[PDB]
Amino acid sequence: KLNLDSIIGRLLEVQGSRPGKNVQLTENEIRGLCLKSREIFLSQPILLELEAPLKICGAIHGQYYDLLRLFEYGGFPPESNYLFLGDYVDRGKQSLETICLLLAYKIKYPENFFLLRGNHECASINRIYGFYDECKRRYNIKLWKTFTDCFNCLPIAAIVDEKIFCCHGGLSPDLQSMEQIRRIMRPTDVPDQGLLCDLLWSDPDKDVQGWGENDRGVSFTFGAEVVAKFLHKHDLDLICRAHQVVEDGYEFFAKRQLVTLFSAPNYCGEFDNAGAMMSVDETLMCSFQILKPAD
């Protein structure tokens, strides 16, 4: 058996810590979490269809202490259903505590808690924003190569109540029909180009019309009209998305028909932003709760 509650215990036990205490687990515990959660992700749809109420959250980037305080106010699983919009690893102090806690809850409550693939959930990039090094030191590279094979199987996007479309990055020029998503096979890496890539990498931009280029050097920007076009075609009312720090934690775009969510406050210590999450009520009335740092 996998002692799932022992793992979750030790992970949560550090909540009241000052300073930021580390959590110590074994390779065969964490190797367990990956191999056990991998099955779950391959069983559930590549494009999730879900039902309200649920709380939706943006990037976390290993900001483990902040993740805990999100749960502290939003309520721990399964008392609130959750959907997370990717970007779990890299940059923050504690990628491993972060991804392990989320993989743990995804095994503990497999129908009450969901994880979408961010852009950082691929090898080639967490090689260079530091997750590979957090592994190389605290455990070993052999562990990291397992986490990669976990990430290569996460779901891409979610539609809540057939009306809110969520994914990590945004739209694509090639995203014409949902079946193109459902036809992507897993496991897969994130390629440099095309639908899968664009879903993870793209951005809204008010200064652009149609499919503009992107400073990130992969995939596109998209303008306020392109949202309006997409919503109608699929009978949606909202796009929700992450992938980009914004000061308010929630930033509306395109006439309040798209929103970008960033959950990590005071990101990397480099920015003065609030972090935020979106509580979807059962009636599909959204609301926001904002984890705002002190000035």
Binding site: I125, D192, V218
Partner: protein, 186 residues
């Protein structure tokens, strides 16, 4: 090859100092640069803010061969690592940097040419020339670069301030001449 030297007495910049750098190459984790002020020591400008899969030459206008203003974030003197960022520089700080650099580069430009006329064959002699000349004033004003430039401009008004520098007559003669060629205002 010809002689080269540090602009300032200090062999390394301090953290939170803003420095002028030449962008030499772009690599996966950032741009390798050369610190012009510190005898072309290697520093590196870090990939920062927005996530990149790959970096185009154009990104943040970092380009190649360009001189750019950056703040020093981290120095390992033990390893010789200097890590830099373009993100935190304000436009006024860039201008102050370009001014400090222009002045200091001018002082260097004089003293290398002074050493050329004095036929100094070693960077050791060039540094000695700097230690006895520029860096005395650098202390006098307690200012890197500005102190030297200010004194060198004063030497046009009155040359007698060069007498306290512990110089050979030959050094002083060449210096007075060389200053006249470079700082007499056209």
């Amino acid at each position: 090859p010809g002689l080269s030297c540090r602009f300032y007495q200090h062999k390394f910049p301090e953290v939170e100092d803003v420095v002028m750098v030449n962008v030499r190459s772009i690599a996966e984790m950032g741009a390798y640069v050369s610190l012009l002020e510190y005898n072309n020591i290697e520093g590196m400008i870090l990939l920062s803010e927005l996530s990149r899969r790959r970096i185009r030459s154009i990104n943040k206008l970092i380009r190649i061969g360009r001189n750019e203003c950056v703040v020093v974030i981290r120095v390992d003197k033990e390893k010789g690592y200097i890590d830099l960022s373009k993100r935190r520089v304000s436009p006024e700080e860039a201008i102050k940097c370009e001014d400090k650099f222009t002045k200091s580069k001018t002082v260097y430009s004089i003293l290398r040419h002074v050493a050329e006329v004095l036929e100094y064959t070693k960077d050791e002699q060039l540094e000695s020339l700097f230690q006895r000349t520029a860096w005395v004033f650098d202390d006098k004003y307690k200012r890197p670069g500005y102190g030297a430039y200010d004194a060198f401009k004063h030497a046009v008004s009155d040359p007698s301030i060069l007498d306290s520098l512990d110089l050979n007559e030959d050094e002083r003669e060449v210096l007075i001449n060389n200053i006249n060629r470079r700082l007499t205002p056209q």
